[PDB]
Amino acid sequence: RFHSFSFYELKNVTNNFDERPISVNKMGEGVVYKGYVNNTTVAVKKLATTEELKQQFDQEIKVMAKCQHENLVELLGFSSDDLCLVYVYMPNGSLLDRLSCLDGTPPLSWHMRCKIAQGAANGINFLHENHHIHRDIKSANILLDEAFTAKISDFGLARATVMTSRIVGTTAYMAPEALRGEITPKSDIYSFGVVLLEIITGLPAVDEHREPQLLLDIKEEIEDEEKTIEDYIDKKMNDADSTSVEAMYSVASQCLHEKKNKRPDIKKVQQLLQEMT
Ligand SMILES: CC(C)n1ccc2ncnc(N[C@H]3CC[C@H](N(C)C)CC3)c21
Secondary structure, eight states, X not given: OOEEOOHHHHHXXXXXXOOSXXXXXXXXXXXXXXXXXXXXXXXXXXXXXXXXXXXXXXXXXXXXXXXXXXXXXXXXXXXXXXXXXXXXXXXXXXXXXXXXXXXXXXXXXXXXXXHHHHHHHXXXXXXXXXXXXXXXXXXXXXXXXXXXXXXXXXXSSOBOOEEOSSOOSOGGGOOHHHHTTEEOHHHHHHHHHHHHXXXXXXXXXXXXXXXXXXXXXXXXXXXXXXXXXXXXSOTTOSOOOHHHHHHHHHHHHHHTOSSGGGSOXXXXXXXXXXXXX
């Protein structure tokens, strides 16, 4: 299974869990730190009720032990002697940050965006084939390696027509039934639909200083002929073509069906994204 790391080894390779940003070991905020084990760069997540957090720690390791795939983040180890999770470092960060060009990275081309959408769908397919529900599909949870290969991340909420008293996930990406407490892989499809809109538009899922505030509402604007998908295509690309953009939008629109049973399954989503290219 997985190797244990001494808390002190992790402390020592993250410069005593140096909370200062890399620019000034903090990569994100528990808190994620950049570490170095031998000649390998790693991501160290230091977890921050206490009982609930230990359950999330145990659950995540359990999901990672079972779910190994090219389009899923790989867990390298853990520490429980304070809780830490050690992952393969993704040098190109999240899809959210690449879409926003955070820290001055160049915009992603339409070509790269198509590969990332296909890769992300492949990762979700592996999860659904293996009877797992992610529960928090979003662009911040799609990481990018050295070749911009999409890697589904954050299995802290992952579960193996069921209800819950503890509604979890990210509101701007959640399916109506998920907001009501239902647990289903059909909700992961809906959230993926929002990610596809982020890829087409380059816009965040929610923006308080925007009309509409929620990205998913652009589907209604397009359906009611108030706007076109053309109007919303990210202007930070030079290689997008109407045919493939409309093909990705058709997939996003199908994923975003309000009625869970009318949405395509992940295998259909993969097929449609393959046909697009
Ligand atoms: C699962 C996650 C902890 N993880 C696993 C491997 C890995 N490698 C690099 N970064 C990661 N997380 C970043 C958090 C901060 C994010 N922004 C700057 C806000 C960008 C992504 C990684």
